[PDB]
Design a protein around this ligand. Structure first.
Ligand SMILES: [K+]
Ligand SMILES: [Mg+2]
Ligand SMILES: [Mg+2]
Ligand SMILES: [Mg+2]
Ligand SMILES: [Mg+2]
Ligand SMILES: [Mg+2]
Ligand SMILES: [Mg+2]
Ligand SMILES: [Mg+2]
Ligand SMILES: [Mg+2]
Lengths: 164, 137, 126, 206, 86
RNA sequence: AAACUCCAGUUGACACAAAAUAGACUACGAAAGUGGCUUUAACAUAUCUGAACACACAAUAGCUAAGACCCAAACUGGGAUUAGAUACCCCACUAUGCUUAGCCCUAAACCUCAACAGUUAAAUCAACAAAACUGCUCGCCAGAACACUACGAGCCACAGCUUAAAACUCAAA
C-alpha cells in the first residue's frame, strides 16, 4: 500500500496558519516507528474494525492502516487536517472513513455493522479503539466510556470492545 | 486670621460657621469608590439618609459603572436629591481608591452642593484578614 | 547578596493590555510615582504589548503646547522604571516588560478636519 | 542644471530695494549684506518689475499653454480679460442707478474672486491598506487648492460639449459664473466637500 | 470605629478650592505610606517575597544615595579649563 | 456570564482569626525561628575539641483525637472562553492554615564558609565565589553511572525516615 508522506512540523504550522513554532499549543507524534509500536501493543488487528480518535497529522492512522484492518473510522475535530486524511483515504481505497465532529459527542453504536455485535460473555467483539488525543480531552472520554461500559451502551453495544 | 487646614473640634469653640450652622451639624456625603461601582449617600449630622445614588441606579451597566462619567452622574443625582431636602454645604467622606473617587465629588459640586471638607476613610487593616492570592494572568 | 557588586556591574495579550492600561491609569492618578508627574495630569490612550512580551508601549495623549509635551516626555522616560517597579511590587503582573512611553497624535487629524469643516462651504443642502 | 547650487533665485521686487536703511531690521540688514556675496541667477523671461504684473494670471496663462505656445496662451488670456470687461460694461450700462454701485467692472478683481470661490479647502487621498482603495479626507495645502481651482476651471473650459464656442468666450462666461458662486466648477467643489464629509469616519483609520 | 470622626485624614477646603484640598489629601496619604499600604494589601505578599523586596529597596536607596554623593562631590571640579593649551 | 437580592449605604453592638506605621532599625535565640500590650518565670559552662546511632530540640507540609472558623485555600462543583478553549479569568465551598494533648523528623534546614586559637608578613592568588594563610581537633571524601537504589539493621513511621552496597557497562564524568 502506497501512502502519502507523513506531514512535517513546518507543513503542520502552515496548515494551522500559525506562521510560528511558539503558538502551536499542541504536541505531535511524528515518528511512524513509535506509532507502529503502539498499534502493535493494541493487539492483532487483522480483519478488524478500528475506531481511531484524534489522528491529527495521522501517524497512528498510517500505522493502523499498514496493519490489515477491515475498515478504519476516523473522527477529527479540525477541518484543517481533513485534507491530509482525505489524501490518505485516496491512497487506501475503502479502509478509511473520515468524520468531522467531536469524539465526546460522536455516536459509535450506529457506526459499524450490526453483525459484529457479540455477546458480552464472549471474547472482545473484533472492534478496537485506538487513541492518541490531547491530555485535556482524554480523561473526560475515559470517564464517559467507563459509564458506557457500566451501561453496556455506546461503543460497547458490540460487546467488550478493547481500548488503547 | 490664618486659615486652618485641620478641621474644627466639637469641644473647643470656633468661629467657623456655614449658613449659621457649626461644623458638626453639616450634612455628610459618604462616597464609596469601589473598583467597578461608586455609591454616594448623603446623610444628616444625626445620620438621617437624605439622598442616595450609585452608578448602577443611574442606568449604567456592568463595566460602564466603573468610569468617571458614571460616578459624575451618580454624584449629580445625589446632589439634586439632597438639594431638594435643604442641603447646600456638605462634608465629603471618601472610602476606597476606585476610578470614581474624584468624579463623584465633581458630580456633587456640579449639582450645587458646596464641599467644606474632604475626609478619607478607606479601610486599612493593621494586618487583620488575609488578602486573596495574586492573580496569575 | 553583594548589592554593591550587583548595582556596580492573541486573546491573552488583549486582556494583559487592558489590565496594564487600568493599572497605569491608577498609578498616574496619585503622587505614588512622584509629585512632579502628578502635577502634569498625564492621560493614557492605550497600552500595547509586543507579540514577544519584550516591551510595553503606553500611548499617552499629547497636548498642543510643545514645551509641555517635551517636559512630559522627559519626566515619563525618567519615571518609567519606577512605574515598572511599582507594578511588579503591587503584584498586578508577576513579570512586566520594560515600559516605553510613546506619544499619541491620532486625534490631531480629526481635530484639524473638524476645524476646517466648521468654516467650509458646502453650498445648498449642507 | 546649468546653475551651480551657490546660485540663488533673483528677487525682482522693485520697492524692496527702495526700503530706507533706517527701517531695516538687524536680521533684514544682515540678509541684505549676505546677498551681496551670493551669485544670482539671471532673471527669467516672464516676471518683470512692471506695475501691471499679476503672478496669478501668469500662472493661469502658463497652465493654458499647449506645446510651448506662450503667444497664443497670452492672447487667449487677454481676450478673456477684455471679454469680461466688455460684458461688465454692457451689464453696467443697462443697470438701474442703485444697481450700478454693485456691478464690478475690473476684470482682475473678478478673476481673482472667481478663482478664490472655487478653491477647495479639503480633499481626498487614495490609500489601499486592506486590499481595497480607501479615499480618506485630508487638509489641502494652500498651494494645492490654488492649483486645483485653476485646473478645474481649465478642464471645465476644455470640455467637448462646448462645440465651436471659442475659449475666450467660454472662459469669460465661466469666470463670471464663478464670481456669483454658480456654475459647474462650484458644483465640483461642493461635490468634493460633501464626499469628504460622507467619508469622515475614514479619518479614524488614518 | 471607636475613634472620633472628622479628625483623621481630614482636610479643610480653602476659598472653595476643592481641587487643591483633594490633592493635598492625596499628598498626605502618599507621604504617610497609606496609599502604598492600600495598594499592597489587595493581594497577599508572601513573607519571603516581602523580605526580599524590603532588602532590595533599602539597598537601592543606599546605593543611589552613595552615587549621588559621589557625583555631587566630583561636580566641584567641573568648570572652565584654567590651563587650556597645556 | 453565573452568584446574591434574609441584597447594598450610613450608624451602633460585636473574635479561639493575625498583629499598619515604628522598621531607612539589624536586635534576641544552639538552630529551626522570633517584630500588638501588660505581668511572672527566664536566656548553661572562669580552658578548647568532642557522636547518623547516646541525651534533648528541629520551618512548611502530613497524620490521630477533641474544639474554634473571619479570611485565605490544595481538591470538588458551577460561569466564560478556541476550534482539542485559560491549567491561568469569575463565583461557591472542603482538607489545611488556629487552640489543647500526641506523632511524623524532612528543606536552596545556605553565609552552599566545621569548632577554637592566632597572623597580615610573605609569592596575594589556577578560575569564580567571599582577601591569603598558620596551629590543633572532630566529621567526611578517593572516576562516572548503577544509586537520595537493592539487601541487612533500626525507628509511634508500614510506601515513610536514617545508614547504605555489589554484578554488568564506559573512557570518560
Ligand atoms: K541561602
Ligand atoms: Mg563542647
Ligand atoms: Mg561516627
Ligand atoms: Mg518538624
Ligand atoms: Mg499542622
Ligand atoms: Mg475550613
Ligand atoms: Mg496550609
Ligand atoms: Mg563540630
Ligand atoms: Mg529507601
Amino acid at each position: 500500500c502506497r501512502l502519502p508522506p507523513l506531514p512535517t512540523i513546518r507543513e503542520i504550522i502552515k496548515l494551522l496558519r500559525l506562521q510560528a513554532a511558539k503558538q502551536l499549543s499542541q504536541n505531535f507524534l511524528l515518528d511512524l516507528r513509535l506509532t507502529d509500536k503502539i498499534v502493535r501493543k493494541a493487539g492483532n488487528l487483522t480483519n478488524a474494525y478500528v475506531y481511531e480518535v484524534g489522528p491529527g497529522p495521522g501517524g497512528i492512522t498510517r500505522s493502523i492502516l499498514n496493519a490489515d484492518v477491515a475498515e478504519l473510522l476516523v473522527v477529527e475535530k479540525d477541518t484543517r487536517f481533513i485534507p491530509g486524511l482525505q489524501m490518505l483515504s485516496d491512497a487506501a481505497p475503502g479502509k478509511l472513513r473520515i468524520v468531522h465532529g467531536d469524539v465526546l459527542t460522536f455516536k459509535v453504536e450506529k457506526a459499524f455493522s450490526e453483525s459484529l455485535k457479540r455477546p458480552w460473555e464472549d471474547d472482545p467483539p473484533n472492534v478496537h479503539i485506538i487513541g492518541n488525543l490531547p491530555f485535556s480531552v482524554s480523561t473526560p472520554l475515559i470517564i464517559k466510556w467507563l459509564e458506557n461500559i457500566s451501561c453496556r451502551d455506546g461503543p460497547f453495544v458490540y460487546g467488550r470492545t478493547q481500548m488503547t | 486670621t490664618k486659615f486652618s487646614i485641620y478641621p474644627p473640634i466639637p469641644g473647643e469653640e470656633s468661629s467657623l460657621r456655614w449658613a449659621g450652622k457649626k461644623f458638626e451639624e453639616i450634612p455628610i456625603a459618604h462616597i464609596k469608590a469601589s473598583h467597578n461601582n461608586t455609591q454616594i449617600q448623603v446623610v444628616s449630622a444625626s445620620n438621617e439618609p437624605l439622598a442616595f445614588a450609585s452608578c448602577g441606579t443611574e442606568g449604567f451597566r456592568n463595566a460602564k459603572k466603573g468610569t468617571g462619567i458614571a460616578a459624575q452622574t451618580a454624584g449629580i443625582a445625589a446632589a439634586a436629591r439632597a438639594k431638594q431636602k435643604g442641603v447646600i454645604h456638605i462634608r465629603v467622606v471618601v472610602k476606597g481608591l476606585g476610578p470614581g473617587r474624584l468624579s463623584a465629588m465633581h458630580g456633587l459640586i456640579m449639582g450645587g452642593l458646596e464641599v467644606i471638607s474632604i475626609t478619607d476613610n478607606t479601610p486599612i487593616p493593621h494586618n487583620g484578614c488575609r488578602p486573596r492570592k495574586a492573580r496569575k494572568l | 547578596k553583594n548589592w554593591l557588586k550587583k548595582f556596580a556591574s492573541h486573546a491573552r495579550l488583549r486582556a494583559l493590555n487592558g489590565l496594564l492600561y487600568k493599572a497605569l491609569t491608577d498609578l498616574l492618578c496619585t503622587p505614588e510615582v512622584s509629585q512632579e508627574l502628578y502635577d502634569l495630569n498625564v492621560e493614557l490612550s492605550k497600552v500595547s504589548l509586543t507579540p514577544d512580551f519584550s516591551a510595553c508601549r503606553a500611548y499617552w495623549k499629547t497636548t498642543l503646547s510643545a514645551e509641555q509635551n517635551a517636559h512630559m516626555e522627559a519626566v515619563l522616560q525618567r519615571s518609567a522604571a519606577h512605574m515598572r517597579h511599582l507594578l511588579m511590587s503591587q503584584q498586578t503582573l508577576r513579570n512586566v516588560p520594560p515600559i516605553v512611553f510613546v506619544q499619541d497624535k491620532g486625534n490631531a487629524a480629526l481635530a484639524e478636519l473638524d476645524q476646517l469643516l466648521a468654516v467650509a462651504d458646502f453650498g445648498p443642502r449642507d | 542644471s546649468r546653475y551651480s547650487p551657490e546660485f540663488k533665485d533673483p528677487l525682482i521686487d522693485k520697492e524692496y530695494y527702495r526700503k530706507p536703511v533706517e527701517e531695516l531690521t538687524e536680521e533684514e540688514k544682515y540678509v541684505r549684506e549676505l546677498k551681496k556675496t551670493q551669485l544670482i541667477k539671471a532673471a527669467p523671461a516672464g516676471k518683470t518689475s512692471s506695475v501691471f504684473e499679476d503672478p496669478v494670471i501668469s500662472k493661469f496663462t502658463n497652465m493654458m499653454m499647449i506645446g510651448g505656445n506662450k503667444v497664443l496662451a497670452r492672447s487667449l488670456m487677454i481676450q478673456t480679460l477684455e471679454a469680461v470687461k466688455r460684458k461688465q460694461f454692457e451689464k453696467y450700462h443697462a443697470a438701474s442707478a442703485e444697481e450700478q454701485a454693485t456691478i464690478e467692472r475690473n476684470p482682475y478683481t473678478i478673476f481673482h474672486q472667481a478663482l478664490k470661490n472655487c478653491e477647495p479647502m479639503i480633499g481626498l487621498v487614495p490609500i489601499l491598506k486592506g486590499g481595497r482603495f480607501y479615499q480618506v479626507p485630508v487638509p489641502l495645502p494652500d498651494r494645492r487648492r490654488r492649483f486645483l481651482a485653476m485646473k478645474w476651471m481649465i478642464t471645465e473650459c476644455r470640455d467637448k460639449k462646448h462645440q465651436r464656442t471659442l475659449m475666450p468666450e467660454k472662459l469669460s462666461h465661466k469666470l463670471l459664473e464663478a464670481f456669483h458662486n454658480q456654475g459647474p466648477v462650484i458644483k465640483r467643489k461642493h461635490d468634493l466637500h460633501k464626499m469628504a464629509e460622507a467619508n469622515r469616519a475614514l479619518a479614524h483609520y488614518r | 470605629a471607636k475613634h472620633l470622626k472628622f479628625i483623621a485624614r481630614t482636610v479643610m477646603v480653602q476659598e472653595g478650592n476643592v481641587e487643591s484640598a483633594y490633592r493635598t489629601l492625596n499628598r498626605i496619604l502618599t507621604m504617610d505610606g497609606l496609599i502604598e499600604d492600600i495598594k499592597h494589601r489587595r493581594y497577599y505578599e508572601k513573607p519571603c517575597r516581602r523580605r526580599q523586596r524590603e532588602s532590595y529597596e533599602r539597598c537601592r536607596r543606599i546605593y543611589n544615595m552613595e552615587m549621588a554623593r559621589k557625583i555631587n562631590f566630583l561636580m566641584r571640579k567641573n568648570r572652565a579649563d584654567p590651563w587650556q593649551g597645556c
